[model samples]
Target: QVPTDPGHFSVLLDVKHFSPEEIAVKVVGEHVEVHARHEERPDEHGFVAREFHRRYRLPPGVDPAAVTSALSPEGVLSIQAAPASAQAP
Candidate 1:
């Protein structure tokens, strides 16, 4: 189904502890894209953050553009997107 008008949204992400690497956190429209480590161990893998990487997908109607990771460090990522109407609050 198609998305609706602008609104608030959130997404949960887990951080990997077994390995030590920086992961990328991105917030496209709706879709989320993550890339694997290109260096370090030969058998390394990508893992979600322990805490939810809260992401805000503003304007629910707007289509997401494949959220790409920038640099996911070892920590919890919280994304909060509030509507323009509720920007003051």
Candidate 2:
């Protein structure tokens, strides 16, 4: 079993200016993958494209089902989860 914490909020990613629709969170193998992509084009403006890709490893004995992700209104991506034994089934 893993140790407990006060708040236990892990994985904080700053994705300022990125919209929720442009972000994607999924579990790939033993790691959690984040892909935020967007394009800039407003009729009269030049074309532009951007991408943000990152991955974080799951804690020991942490299952993918326990992983949860949320994009805050302040542009902060929160991934929170404890080890397998941290909670009961």
Candidate 3:
């Protein structure tokens, strides 16, 4: 988590080998949820994957409407948020 200012913060998730289409992010009533899944067969190492679901309670003062997410080419998801009343200094 990166706190850019008193009212702004960013959360980064390393989503290596995961595509944006395979991931979902949601915010509900001060809670943040992340879910990821991929349908993959066993590889040479005989590895199978399962879906993931995670929920986190957002800190006070964060505006759910101000939350945004972006998936990068390097397989990273950056979620950013700021308070509704936040402004540039």
The candidates, ranked best first by TM-score, are 3, 2, 1
Tens-place lDDT per residue, model 2, 1-89, is 99976654378999875789899998888888999988884444667677989988776667777789888789999988766666556
Ranking by lDDT: 3, 2, 1
Q: How far is candidate 2 from the true structure (C-alpha RMSD, Å)?
A: 5.2
- What are the C-alpha RMSDs, in order, of all predicted structures? 10.1, 5.2, 4.4
How close to the true structure is residue 87 of candidate 3, measured as C-alpha lDDT?
A: 67
Question: lDDT per residue, candidate 1, 8-84, as tens digits?
Answer: 54444544532334445555546443332423343346533342233443555433442323224653443344333
For candidate 2, the lDDT comes to 0.80
State every prediction's TM-score relative to the real structure. Answer: 0.33, 0.74, 0.76
Better of 1 and 2 by lDDT: 2
Cα misplacement distance, residue 38 of candidate 1 (Å): 5.9
Q: List the residue pairs that clash in candidate 2.
A: none
Runs in model 2 deviating more than 4 A are 1-9, 42-48, 86-89
